[PDB]
């Protein structure tokens, strides 16, 4: 439980290869992104957004 542990905001699936993808890039299934979320402050630069 102390070194290793189950952690939220973590996903697992099969890998895929793509020449049309950047080295640092990665192809993310859309449903995963919708499922996952990033807490983010309400700032003026994005308030309308």
């Amino acid at each position: 439980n102390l070194m290793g542990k189950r952690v939220d905001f973590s996903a697992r699936t099969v890998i895929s290869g793509d020449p049309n993808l950047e080295l640092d890039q990665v192809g993310v299934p859309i449903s995963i992104a919708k499922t996952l979320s990033y807490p983010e402050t309400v700032t003026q630069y994005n308030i309308h957004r």
């Binding site: 402050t41 700032t43 003026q44 630069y45 994005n46 957004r49």
Partner: protein
Amino acid sequence: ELAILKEERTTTPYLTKYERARILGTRALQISMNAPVLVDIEGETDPLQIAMKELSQRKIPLVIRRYLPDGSYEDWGCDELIVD
């Protein structure tokens, strides 16, 4: 006794990637908390680009504190570190 005088800051004048990133993240979080911005924001709505800009301009108002293995700390100002 705890700090080290400004003159004997024997540490390199460059900024470690460690401290560099710590500074960048700290500044980005600060601005994201509506902190006043020491540089201008044109369209860089995201905090992190603003933080990187303020760093390149060396306009980040923070001071390092480098704890030596002996335990003593020396304090380096963000503006004086040699950004590489």
